[PDB]
Amino acid sequence: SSHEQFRAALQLVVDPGDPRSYLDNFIKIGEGSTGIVCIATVRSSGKLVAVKKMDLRKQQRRELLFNEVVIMRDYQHENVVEMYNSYLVGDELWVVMEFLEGGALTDIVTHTRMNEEQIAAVCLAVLQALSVLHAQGVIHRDIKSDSILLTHDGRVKLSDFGFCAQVSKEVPRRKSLVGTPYWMAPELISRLPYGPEVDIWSLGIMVIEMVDGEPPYFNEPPLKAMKMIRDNLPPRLKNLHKVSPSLKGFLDRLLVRDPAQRATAAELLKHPFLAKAGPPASIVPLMRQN
Ligand SMILES: Cn1cnc(Nc2nc(N3CCC(N)CC3)nc3ccc(Cl)cc23)c1
Q: How far is the CA of 239 from the centre of ligand 1 (A)?
A: 28
Tell me how far the alpha carbon of residue 196 is from its chain's centroid. 13
- The residues near 14 (Cβ < 8 Å, ≥ 6 apart) are 69, 85, 86, 87, 88, 93
Q: How far is the CA of 137 from the centre of ligand 1 (A)?
A: 26
Q: What is the rounded CA–CA span in Å between residue 230 and residue 114?
A: 29
Residue 238 DSSP code: S
Q: How many CB atoms lie within 10 A of CB 60?
A: 9
Distances in whole angstroms, Cα of residue 282 to Cα of each of 114, 129, 217, 275, 285: 10, 20, 30, 14, 7
CB of 201 closer than 8 Å to CB of 255? yes
- Taking alpha carbons only, the member of 128, 119, 167, 146 closest to residue 265 is 128
Q: Which three-class secondary structure state does DSSP give residue 204?
A: helix
**Exposure of 92 by Cβ count < 10 A (0-12 exposed, 13-18 middle, 19+ buried)?**
middle
Look at the alpha carbons of 215, 289, 160, 200 in this order and tell me if their dihedral is positive or negative.
Answer: positive
CB of 122 closer than 8 Å to CB of 53? no
Distances in whole angstroms, Cα of residue 87 to Cα of each of 6, 97, 162: 14, 12, 16
Is 208 known to sit in a ligand binding site? no
Distances in whole angstroms, Cα of residue 116 to Cα of each of 70, 153, 191, 212, 255: 34, 18, 34, 13, 18
Tell me how far the alpha carbon of residue 236 is from its chain's centroid. 24
Q: Pick from 28, 37, 109, 144 the residue to mutate for probing ligand 1's pocket: most ligand atoms within 8 Å of its CB.
A: 37
Outline where the chain has alpha helix (H): 3-10, 65-74, 105-109, 116-135, 186-189, 197-212, 222-231, 245-254, 265-268
| Domain-wise residue ranges, the chain | 1-99, 100-290
Q: Pick from 28, 29, 206 the residue to mutate for probing ligand 1's pocket: most ligand atoms within 8 Å of its CB.
A: 29
Q: What is the rounded CA–CA span in Å between residue 284 and residue 262?
A: 32
Q: What is the rounded CA–CA span in Å between residue 53 and residue 87?
A: 10
Report which protein residue has its CA nearest ligand 1's atom 12: 30
CB of 287 closer than 8 Å to CB of 103? yes
Look at the alpha carbons of 205, 146, 163, 274 in this order and tell me if their dihedral is positive or negative.
Answer: positive
Resolution in A: 2.7
> Superfamily assignment of 1-99 in CATH?
Phosphorylase Kinase; domain 1 (3.30.200.20)
CB of 211 closer than 8 Å to CB of 108? no
Which of the following is catalytic: 15, 24, 55, 142?
142
- φ, ψ dihedrals at 153, nearest 5°: -100, 25
Contacts 24+ apart (CB under 8 A), 27-32: 32/160, 32/162
Angle at 148 (CA atoms; ends 146, 153), nearest 5 degrees: 130
Q: What is the rounded CA–CA span in Å between residue 194 and residue 191?
A: 8
CB of 127 closer than 8 Å to CB of 274? yes
Atom of ligand 1 nearest to the CA of 37: 11
Q: What is the rounded CA–CA span in Å between residue 156 and residue 102?
A: 9
β pairing state of 48-55 and 36-42:
antiparallel
Residue ranges around ligand 1 (CB below 6 Å): 29-32, 37, 50, 52, 81, 97-101, 103-104, 146, 149, 159
Asked if 142 is an active-site residue, the reply is: yes
Q: What is the rounded CA–CA span in Å between residue 173 and residue 43?
A: 45
Is 170 known to sit in a ligand binding site? no
Is 282 known to sit in a ligand binding site? no
Q: What is the rounded CA–CA span in Å between residue 80 and residue 121?
A: 15
- The residues near 252 (Cβ < 8 Å, ≥ 6 apart) are none
Residue 34 DSSP code: S
Domain covering 100-290 in this structure, CATH number: 1.10.510.10
Report which protein residue has its CA nearest ligand 1's atom 23: 103
Look at the alpha carbons of 108, 110, 111, 115 in this order and tell me if their dihedral is positive or negative.
Answer: positive
- φ, ψ dihedrals at 97, nearest 5°: -140, 180
Q: How far is the CA of 97 from the centre of ligand 1 (A)?
A: 11
